[PDB]
Design a protein around this nucleic acid. Structure first.
Lengths: 97, 74, 79, 69, 57, 55, 126
RNA sequence: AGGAGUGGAGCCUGCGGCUUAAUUUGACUCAACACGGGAAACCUCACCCGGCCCGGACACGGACAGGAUUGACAGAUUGAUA
RNA sequence: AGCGUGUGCCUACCCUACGCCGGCAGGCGCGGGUAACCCGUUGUGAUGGGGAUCGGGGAUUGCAAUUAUUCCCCAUGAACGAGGAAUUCCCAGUAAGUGCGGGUCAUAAGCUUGCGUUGAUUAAGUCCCUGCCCUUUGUACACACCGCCCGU
């Protein structure tokens, strides 16, 4: 934990713009393979991801030292209830159908 | 094989809590009671800090942390 | 940029093994059997074998699109 | 004659920067181990040398029992 | 590419080792042809595993 | 503050900089040819990588 | 009696000169540790040695300092200055001489305590 | 009735006997004993003279602009520019 | 002659050829190598004969090595010529002597896994010891002989 809240809203913007992602456990390092150069410290961002997926309502799947996530519609409802951003802003992921 | 036996010293410690006063009596004061007031800290001439950077006072080496500036006569 | 051919073949085998394990733990309930990669010029086509295919594609390929997205964003291939 | 001076027994020794000559038997053996100064300074290497045991640390518990036979 | 690895996951049993082998074969062929002929003969639905590196030098 | 401690003396043989890429095991690493696994994990996947018992 | 020399030469005059020819008339054992270079956390032992040197009235034993610095001393100017080091579970102090080049601080600790002999029985006595 | 090299004469480590900070997990003969691919400073040490930032989707309690987070050498710390 | 190793998803650590020159790895530049391309055609026996501790020369640059990393020369003399009970392994490119390369990794080995070079005295047998198996036989054993079991 030991997580700030501006990093929280930054990571919530990241989840809103991203949705489906793959993660790798990296905490002590100063340079990540594929999730650096975000102008934000990496450790707090990854702990923010840990909070998201271990708050007790979104399930995980860990193997081959990696995290693949199944973002449930319960998470969509939770984000809408808390941040009050209408789902009418459709995610950009629905192109190249 | 035995235990680690970290028991001989300091059986129990109490947390260090700072009696930080909610009222700025030790920190800043006016000693004038007027719209225009004087400031009890030396003006910083360094341009590597901000324009509202005010340093505290100790027995010497006013310890800012960011710059470690100490007044010396060369 | 360039790695030795022994390392290249070992890494290709690691690619195959981890992809196989990943879609084994994904869609074992789909009757997955095996995964085969096909060598193509400057591209890597992957063909996946399953007993049932209507379920693996589903409706408009939500599962297929999810799998391709995760594999792309995991393996570091060009977009 | 500037001949390479790495053919003498004790080189770069204390008390003389030049290679002085000595002679007589029963005297080289003593000077092959100049243990006086290291004994004086109260060092462990002096008593490493003195007991005839291993100064660099040769292992002696299953091998290396020679030195007194 | 030899790799020898102890068989037993634990450290119990007779000392038994797996000797794994990976044999990599490589062939070179030289010719004189423009690029179009090479890239027309390459796309021939190659059977899997035969990695191709075509160089001009 | 953070930079006052980190990167003081280089760790040129950091053991903790490597782990099994499948199960994150510290011991029995196989770094030869870049497997980077505990030897047990390699045995589990050796046939799938391409390594086979021939001799 | 006259003061005992170090390799037939004095120290103070060579200390006033640079390191260009300092090693031409020195012994080994710190032959290259002098030449290895400098890093952080080295002026600590020199600083506390200077502190104990200045604050001690002359011709008297100084106060005991606590440290574990297994380091090198590039300058033997500290003739008469001594270093005490924590060894085992207590302190230990060692005689100093003008001869500093040729040895290291860590070469004075005795940890190989003699085997506390036992009287094994019950088991394999034969 | 053979033999060669044998553990003894030229390069240390496993684990039990084995004072405290030293004899530190699993393996009770062939099927344990440089075996856990385990070559002990340290990240891997649980025999270790020492400490810290701590762990709660919840069941119960203390109640908000301060209820402290690795973060100063020189009076010191129990090696340590903690 | 090696069998083989050698540099970015990680990653900051890869293998190595001339000059300052005491006598060479080498303290700094200097290029090659994603590798069949570079490393690399890698006088009758303690005397002269094989080293008991241990010291100097420039040290490879690993905080600390001594509380395991780091060269040979002066010939200072050690039962200096087949080894308590108990003994492990081995039948031809055996064994053994050697070095070399990987795994560990900082070119960290005294370990291990492989590789070559030198290289063969003995036996082409038996069930005596240990143990195994294609039989008959005995049993009161079946937790199976480290069994069962008798006697104040």
């Amino acid at each position: 934990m030991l997580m700030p809240k501006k990093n929280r809203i930054a990571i919530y913007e990241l989840l809103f713009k991203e949705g489906v992602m793959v993660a790798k456990k990296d905490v002590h390092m100063p340079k990540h393979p594929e999730l650096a150069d975000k102008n934000v410290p990496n450790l707090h961002v990854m702990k923010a991801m840990q909070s998201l997926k271990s708050r007790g309502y979104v399930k995980e799947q860990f193997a081959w030292r990696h995290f693949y996530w199944y973002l449930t519609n319960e998470g969509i409802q939770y984000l809408r209830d808390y941040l009050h951003l209408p789902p009418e802003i459709v995610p950009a992921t629905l192109r190249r159908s | 094989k035995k235990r680690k036996k970290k028991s001989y010293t300091t059986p129990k410690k109490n947390k260090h809590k700072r009696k930080k006063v909610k009222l700025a009596v030790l920190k800043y004061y006016k000693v004038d009671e007027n719209g225009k007031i004087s400031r009890l800290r030396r003006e910083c001439p360094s341009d590597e800090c901000g324009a509202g950077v005010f340093m505290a006072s100790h027995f010497d080496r006013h310890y800012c942390g960011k710059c470690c500036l100490t007044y010396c006569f060369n | 940029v360039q790695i030795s051919k022994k390392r290249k073949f070992v890494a290709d085998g690691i690619f195959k093994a981890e992809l196989n394990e990943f879609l084994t733990r994904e869609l074992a309930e789909d009757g997955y059997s095996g995964v085969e990669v096909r060598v193509t010029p400057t591209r890597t086509e992957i063909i996946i074998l399953a007993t049932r295919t209507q379920n693996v594609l589903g409706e408009k390929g939500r599962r297929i699109r999810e799998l391709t997205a995760v594999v792309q964003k995991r393996f570091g291939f060009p977009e | 004659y500037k001949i390479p001076d790495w053919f003498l027994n004790r080189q770069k020794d204390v008390k003389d920067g030049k290679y002085s000559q000595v002679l007589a038997n029963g005297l080289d053996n003593k000077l092959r181990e100049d243990l006086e100064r290291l004994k004086k300074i109260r060092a462990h290497r002096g008593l490493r040398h003195f007991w005839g045991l291993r100064v660099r640390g040769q292992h002696t518990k299953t091998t290396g029992r020679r030195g007194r036979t | 590419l030899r790799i020898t690895t102890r068989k037993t996951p634990c450290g119990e049993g007779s000392k038994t080792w797996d000797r794994f082998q990976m044999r990599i074969h490589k062939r070179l062929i030289d010719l004189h042809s423009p690029s179009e002929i090479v890239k027309q003969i390459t796309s021939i639905s190659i059977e899997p595993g035969v990695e191709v590196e075509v160089t001009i030098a | 503050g953070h930079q006052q401690l980190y990167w003081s003396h280089p760790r040129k043989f950091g053991q903790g900089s490597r782990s099994c890429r499948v199960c994150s095991n510290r011991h029995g690493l196989i770094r030869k040819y870049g497997l980077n696994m505990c030897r047990q994990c390699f045995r589990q996947y050796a046939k799938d990588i391409g390594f086979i018992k021939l001799d | 009696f006259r003061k005992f020399t170090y390799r037939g030469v004095d120290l103070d005059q060579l200390l006033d000169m640079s390191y260009e020819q300092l090693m031409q008339l020195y012994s080994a054992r710190q032959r290259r540790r002098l030449n290895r270079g400098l890093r952080r956390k080295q002026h600590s032992l020199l600083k506390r040695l200077r502190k104990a040197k200045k604050e001690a009235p002359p011709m008297e034993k100084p106060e005991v300092v606590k440290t574990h610095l297994r380091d090198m001393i590039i300058l033997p100017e500290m003739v008469g200055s001594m270093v005490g080091v924590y060894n085992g579970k207590t302190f230990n102090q060692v005689e100093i001489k003008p001869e500093m080049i040729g040895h290291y601080l860590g070469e004075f600790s005795i940890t190989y305590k003699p085997v506390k002999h036992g009287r094994p029985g019950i088991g394999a006595t034969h």
